[PDB]
UniProtKB/Swiss-Prot annotation:
Changing N98A: Abolishes binding to acetylated histones. Interacts with p53/TP53; the interaction is direct. Interacts (via CTD region) with CDK9 and CCNT1, acting as an associated component of P-TEFb complex. Interacts with RELA (when acetylated at 'Lys-310'). Interacts (via NET domain) with NSD3, CHD4, BICRA and ATAD5. The interaction with BICRA bridges BRD4 to the GBAF complex. Interacts (via NET domain) with JMJD6 (via JmjC and N-terminal domains); the interaction is stronger in presence of ssRNA and recruits JMJD6 on distal enhancers. Interacts with NSD3. Interacts with NIPBL. (Microbial infection) Interacts with bovine papillomavirus type 1 regulatory protein E2. This interactions may serve for the tethering of viral genomes to host mitotic chromosomes allowing successful partitioning of the viral genome during cell division. The NET domain mediates interaction with a number of chromatin proteins involved in transcription regulation (NSD3, JMJD6, CHD4, GLTSCR1 and ATAD5). This is Bromodomain-containing protein 4. The lineage of its organism: Eukaryota, Metazoa, Chordata, Craniata, Vertebrata.
């Protein structure tokens, strides 16, 4: 079965607005979200629906853009690096579970390339 999705709010953490965090939502996340190959990454992998019984045996740190989007909207992240790390985990999971040349791997590669193009212009830390 599926685990609960990653937490998207933290009642026990203070919250702040920053140019970097707002950029990660409105520019980085928004641009990847609208890419033709974003769809397999817009929500947690549903291993029951997809019939992938070993997915959560292999992937113990799941992550997806739907979670990242909610985390940004909810001010879950204090440091911009926390968000960048979540994107990295999402891509790395894909490379762990799947094989070279799989459709999903090509889709991750396109997204990851776009991600690097967008974080290139991340505002400086304040
Ligand atoms: C290859 C399986 C996979 C997906 C994926 O999402 N594939 C998917 C395929 C068909 C339907 C649905 S779906 O029914 O859940 N669906 C309707 C279209 C989405 C709304 C999802 N994502 C990742 C990161 C992986 C892996 C294993 O790395």
């Amino acid at each position: 079965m599926n685990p609960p999705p990653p937490e998207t709010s933290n009642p026990n953490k203070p919250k702040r607005q920053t140019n970097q965090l707002q950029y990660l939502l409105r520019v980085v996340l928004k641009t990847l979200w609208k890419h033709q190959f974003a769809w397999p990454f817009q929500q947690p992998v549903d291993a029951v629906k997809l019939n992938l019984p070993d997915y959560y045996k292999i992937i113990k740190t799941p992550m997806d853009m739907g979670t990242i989007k909610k985390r940004l909207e909810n001010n879950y992240y204090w440091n911009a690096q926390e968000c960048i790390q979540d994107f990295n985990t999402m891509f790395t999971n894909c490379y762990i579970y799947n094989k070279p040349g799989d459709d999903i791997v090509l889709m991750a590669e396109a997204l990851e390339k776009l991600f690097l193009q967008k974080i290139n212009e991340l505002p400086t830390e304040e």
